[PDB]
Design a binder for this molecule. Structure first.
Ligand SMILES: NC(=O)C1=CN([C@@H]2O[C@H](COP(=O)(O)OP(=O)(O)OC[C@H]3O[C@@H](n4cnc5c(N)ncnc54)[C@H](O)[C@@H]3O)[C@@H](O)[C@H]2O)C=CC1
Ligand SMILES: Cc1cc2nc3c(=O)[nH]c(=O)nc-3n(C[C@H](O)[C@H](O)[C@H](O)COP(=O)(O)O)c2cc1C
Ligand code: SF4
Ligand code: SF4
Ligand code: SF4
Ligand code: SF4
Ligand code: FES
Ligand code: FES
Ligand SMILES: [Mg+2]
Lengths: 431, 230, 62, 217, 42, 59
């Protein structure tokens, strides 16, 4: 019914300690409403939690945007003989994304309680949190929060006056972006290289240690405890239909005040940047391009970002996709092709090398983009590069090939004249 | 019984549950292109040369690892599957070395034959190729590492059949290499078979090097007498 | 060079079925040995069996 | 661009299977705890932590450390070699006391990341990947560290320093040289990534427990 | 209230903080499940 | 373009260009070429026998 989104009240946010000003510790969390009526949520049943998540309209906050209730119900099959596990993905690999880090460092207890609630909903025996290897202080804070929860009896032996036993383990990665991918996450947990496995089987069938597993983003896990307490309907109302809820937006690049802020879902991009980022550097007329959902999403120019919303459907209709809600802005004083080439170079150093399309094609793309930056190529190559991207995309084991091909496609589609001009200039200066 | 009906090119076939798309195509008489899949080894899915189109599905599936579903109509000679094969073959040949005249696997190369029957007839690769250093794993298997396509057949055979965990992949992405990471000889009574399973000239026979071409050889079926297995 | 004395060293014939070859050999008066066709038996392949919970099949690497 | 690091090991007097390495008894207790977390069937899962612990005891990973980890966890040494050569936080070569990583990915590069890298190079007089002669500092260019909002930033020995200017990184370097430990976190006193002068969200005091709970619970 | 930053303690974390906390935490964990054998290679 | 007597060439360094690939032997319409090869003492891929029958050659 509502038509305008982006005015979210201060009291109406979920991460009330996003900036780490309140005492995050267990005492502070309780003061902010955390660990309230957990037993009531545990005792009410897993089916009730799954129904609340379904009616909440919640979708994966990681990037895919898949309905989380559907996955957690995929777990809801009866027992098999194997233990069931809930793995929380805290890899936080994507460039320009810092949301997971802030809600782990300054607010761990909501993550722990969401882990417990999701484990109860999915019948999981324990929770494994794969924290990034670089996030050492964040991991230590999460560990001490888990220790505090264990001391208070909030997790572990009976975990409550409930009768449900649940453990929360924290495992640390070692410098690997591919380990963020859920199957590569599982492989890294099991002590092998972070190479993704094929699907099927899905983690709900054969996951960590061969046991049924559900992998969820840190942001997705945190909202569930609050969602259960305030109800599915309250969460559903925000944003548009099939895009319900509130989202954490990380605005960076060429802005006056780069910041992480939680806001309503279908907020206009320009309104969000002006309100929270302080506006783009040099005024809105200085803007050249925006990458809305981290490096794995195609860029959009000013004419598209003028009147574009921020959710899955609208950003897909803009041929970008929401992704990880990671806004990176670029004004007209920066080399856009250099930025895209740097992204492709990053993807070249972050591929696991398992399958030939991603490995060979992404190395080829990096070399081609390096040649493009100097204009050393010819115009007829541009279409060739496009075809390369098409070949790599949809033929790989995991979606890292997609995340390497899409930026190239967006750059070509929106700035082919720039590449042709650079090539012509190189030809002139070299004869 | 428990057989399910699947269609390969519009033709009905009855298969067991868990049968892969590749085996369903086999039962009708087609061989799907492959480099990493082997019947005797565990499924890998690395090569992506088995990608085939399932009708009314936008994404191609790996035939060597995807179990067939009831009522599925595989489209093996569809335009999408042919384009996927050409793209994968292009990626495979982008970094491959121009070693065919000096390679001991000239007329017995799966890479060559599958390029001829499923790839394109030309290249659009304008960059420079890569080169990795060779490894020494004993006097029986000659290793020329640049030719290797990272199929991982040798690793799976060593770990599962020979029972030896000496072979592995080191590094990441484009620079990932198959070897031992240390100077160590892979020696076992079953060590030579990795020459046969290797589709390329990365692993060749050392005593047999440079002596003959496959089209010249006359093949005589006979029996081993070095033991009582026969 | 390699010298020979038999005219039938390079003679190889192709047939659709075993019966056709047997008939040709019988009508041409040649004693023959017939070998039954070897077929690779069907095999049970499962990708998920690689990631086994308790069985020996689980792979150490991939 | 190119990697520059080899993925084959050749025996060296300071890097060989006979190089002395072992675990401190407290590190052995830590190893026992780490193994305990996983199910009693799959002790192979502990390889990433234990290896890391070995590095935290030594500063780098010789082949002897990998062999010891494989022997303790009863896994083939080749698997430990794959794990060591796969993940980029493992040092298979000796490294300086302070390991400086400067992120140069596009979000950090946009906010003038190259100036900080060049300032560090000028201060230390070493190239991008070299090490200072007195075995004190090491400079590495890495991928995004998840601190894009605080860009430009560099990470040294588990410590994050965000919102650097050239000057700020010079004070960080010579304060590390002096002997004391600089305080981690962003510079300019913006207190972990809210708007510098905006403060547009989370202003009024946070709500008390049970504020939004629905009826019947 | 709002102005003070409360995440400073992590200014005094040592190199062994994570593993020491895990060692302390090990006594609160439920017994691990078992697959039946000592290792998949057994 | 004239086709006359056959010859084996070598590189400017002085090593023979032939690598014993046996493609000339395979393509020869008259089977006039006979080749035998083995690894040289330095490990090079060189022929030990390269015969052409001028009386079977069709030039
Ligand atoms: N938050 C971060 O740091 C990063 C996020 N990403 C985002 O990850 C996205 C791609 O991730 P994917 O997992 O590959 O997309 P996906 O749609 O294939 O799967 C995502 C989730 O949906 C589940 N799922 C999907 N289809 C299913 C089915 N038929 N049955 C059961 N479960 C199913 C999967 O189990 C998985 O948990 C990208 O859009 C990217 O933006 C990428 C890099 C980093
Ligand atoms: C290369 C790659 C890296 C990824 N990295 C992450 C990550 O760091 N964090 C994350 O939550 N999801 C990541 N994802 C997507 C995961 O699939 C996602 O975490 C998981 O499906 C859970 O999503 P949900 O929380 O929306 O259910 C990545 C996907 C790919 C292809
Ligand atoms: S697409 Fe890249 S990262 Fe993903 S499995 Fe293939 S090689 Fe590995
Ligand atoms: S392995 Fe095959 S394609 Fe590669 S050089 Fe040898 S013959 Fe040519
Ligand atoms: S050496 Fe041969 S079998 Fe082994 S990975 Fe390379 S191509 Fe495959
Ligand atoms: S064998 Fe024949 S084709 Fe091959 S290099 Fe020697 S002369 Fe040339
Ligand atoms: S044969 Fe299927 S991916 Fe290689
Ligand atoms: S891009 Fe530098 S920390 Fe993310
Ligand atoms: Mg071979």
């Amino acid at each position: 019914k509502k038509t305008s989104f982006g005015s979210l009240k201060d009291e109406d946010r979920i991460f009330t300690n996003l900036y780490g000003r309140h005492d995050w510790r267990l005492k502070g969390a309780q003061s902010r409403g955390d660990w309230y009526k957990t037993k009531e949520i545990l005792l009410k049943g897993p089916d009730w939690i799954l129904g609340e998540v379904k009616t909440s309209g919640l979708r994966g906050r990681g990037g895919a945007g898949f309905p989380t209730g559907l996955k957690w119900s995929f777990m809801n099959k009866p027992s098999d003989g194997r233990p069931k596990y809930l793995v929380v993905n805290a890899d936080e690999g994507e460039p320009g994304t810092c949301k997971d880090r802030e809600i782990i460092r300054h607010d761990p207890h909501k993550l722990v309680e969401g882990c417990l609630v999701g484990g109860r909903a999915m019948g999981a025996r324990a929770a494994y949190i794969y924290i990034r290897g670089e996030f050492y202080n964040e991991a230590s804070n999460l560990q001490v929060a888990i220790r505090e929860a264990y001391e208070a009896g909030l997790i572990g032996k009976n975990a409550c006056g409930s009768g449900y036993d649940f453990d929360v383990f924290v495992v640390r990665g070692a410098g690997a972006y591919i380990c963020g991918e859920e199957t590569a996450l599982i492989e890294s947990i099991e002590g092998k290289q972070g190479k993704p496995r094929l699907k099927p089987p899905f983690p709900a069938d054969v996951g960590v240690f061969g046991c049924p597993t559900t992998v969820a983003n840190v942001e997705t896990v945190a909202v569930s405890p609050t969602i259960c307490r305030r109800g599915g309907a309250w969460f559903a109302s925000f944003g548009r239909e099939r895009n319900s809820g509130t989202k954490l937006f990380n605005i960076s690049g060429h802005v006056n005040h780069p910041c992480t802020v939680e806001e309503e879902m279908s907020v206009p991009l320009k309104e969000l940047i002006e309100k929270h980022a302080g506006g783009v550097i040099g005024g809105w007329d200085n803007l050249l391009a925006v990458i809305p959902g981290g490096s794995s999403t195609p860029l959009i120019p000013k004419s598209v970002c003028e009147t574009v919303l921020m959710d899955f459907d609208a950003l897909v209709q803009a041929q970008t996709g929401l992704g990880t809600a990671a806004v990176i802005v670029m004004d007209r004083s920066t080399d856009i092709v250099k930025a895209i080439a740097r992204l492709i170079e990053f993807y070249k150093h972050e591929s696991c090398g398992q399958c030939t399309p991603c490995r060979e094609g992404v190395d080829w793309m990096n070399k081609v983009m390096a040649r493009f930056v100097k204009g050393d190529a010819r115009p007829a190559e541009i279409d060739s590069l496009w075809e390369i991207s098409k070949q790599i995309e949809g033929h790989t084991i995991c979606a890292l090939g997609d995340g390497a091909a899409w930026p190239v496609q967006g750059l070509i589609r929106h700035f082919r004249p720039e590449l042709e001009e650079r090539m012509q200039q190189f030809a002139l200066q070299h004869q | 019984s428990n057989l399910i009906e699947v269609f390969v090119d519009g033709q009905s076939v009855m298969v067991e549950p868990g049968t892969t798309v590749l085996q369903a195509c086999e039962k009708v008489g087609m061989q799907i292109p492959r480099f990493c899949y082997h019947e005797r080894l565990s499924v890998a899915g690395n090569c992506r040369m088995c990608l085939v189109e399932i009708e009314k599905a936008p994404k191609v599936v790996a035939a060597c690892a995807m179990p067939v579903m009831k009522g599925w109509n595989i489209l093996t000679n569809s335009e999408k599957s042919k384009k996927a094969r050409e793209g994968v073959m292009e990626f495979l040949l982008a970094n491959h070395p121009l070693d065919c005249p000096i390679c001991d696997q000239g007329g017995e190369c799966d890479l060559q034959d599958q390029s001829m029957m499923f790839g394109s007839d030309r290249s659009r690769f304008l960059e420079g190729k890569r080169a990795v250093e060779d490894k020494n794993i004993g006097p029986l298997v000659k290793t020329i590492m640049t030719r290797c396509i990272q199929c991982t057949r040798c690793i799976r055979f060593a770990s599962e059949i020979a029972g030896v965990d000496d072979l592995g992949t080191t590094g990441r992405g484009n620079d990932m290499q198959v070897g031992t990471y240390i100077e160590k000889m892979f020696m076992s009574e079953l060590s030579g078979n990795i020459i046969d399973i290797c589709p390329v000239g990365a692993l060749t026979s050392k005593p047999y090097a440079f002596t003959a071409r496959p089209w010249e050889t006359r093949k005589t079926e006979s029996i081993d007498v070095m033991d009582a297995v026969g | 060079w390699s010298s020979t004395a038999d005219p039938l060293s390079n003679l190889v014939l192709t047939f659709s079925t075993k019966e056709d070859a047997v008939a040709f050999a019988e009508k041409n008066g040649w004693s023959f040995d017939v070998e039954e066709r070897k077929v690779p038996k069907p095999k049970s392949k499962s990708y998920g069996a690689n990631f086994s919970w308790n069985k020996r099949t689980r792979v150490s690497t991939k | 661009g190119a990697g520059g690091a080899l993925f084959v090991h050749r025996d060296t007097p300071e890097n060989n299977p006979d190089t002395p390495f072992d675990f401190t008894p407290e590190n052995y207790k830590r190893i026992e705890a780490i193994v305990k977390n996983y199910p009693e069937g799959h002790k192979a899962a502990a390889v990433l932590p234990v290896l890391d612990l070995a590095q935290r005891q030594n500063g780098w990973l010789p082949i002897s450390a990998m062999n010891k980890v494989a022997e303790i966890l009863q896994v083939p040494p080749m698997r430990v070699y794959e794990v060591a050569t796969f993940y980029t936080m493992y040092n298979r070569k000796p490294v300086g006391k302070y390991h400086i990583q400067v992120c140069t990915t596009t979000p950090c590069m946009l906010r003038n990341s190259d100036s900080i890298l060049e300032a560090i190079q000028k201060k230390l007089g070493i190239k991008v990947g070299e090490t200072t002669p007195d075995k004190l500092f090491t400079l590495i260019e890495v991928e995004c560290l998840g601190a894009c909002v605080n860009a430009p930033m560099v990470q040294i020995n588990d410590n994050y320093y965000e919102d650097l200017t050239p000057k700020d990184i010079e004070e960080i370097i010579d304060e590390l040289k002096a002997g004391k430990i600089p305080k981690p976190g962003p510079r300019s006193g913006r207190f972990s990534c809210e708007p510098a002068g905006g403060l547009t969200s989370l202003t009024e005091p946070p709500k008390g427990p049970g504020f939004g709970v629905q009826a019947g619970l | 209230d709002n102005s003070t930053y409360r995440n400073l303690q992590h200014h005094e974390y040592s190199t062994y903080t994570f593993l020491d906390l895990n060692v302390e935490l090990s006594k609160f964990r439920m017994p691990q499940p078992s697959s039946g054998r000592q290792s998949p290679r057994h | 373009r004239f086709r006359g007597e056959h010859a084996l060439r070598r590189y400017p360094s002085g090593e023979e260009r032939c690598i014993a690939c046996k493609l000339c032997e395979a393509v020869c319409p008259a089977q006039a070429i006979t080749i035998e090869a083995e690894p040289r003492a330095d490990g090079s891929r060189r022929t030990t026998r390269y015969d052409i029958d001028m009386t079977k050659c069709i030039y």
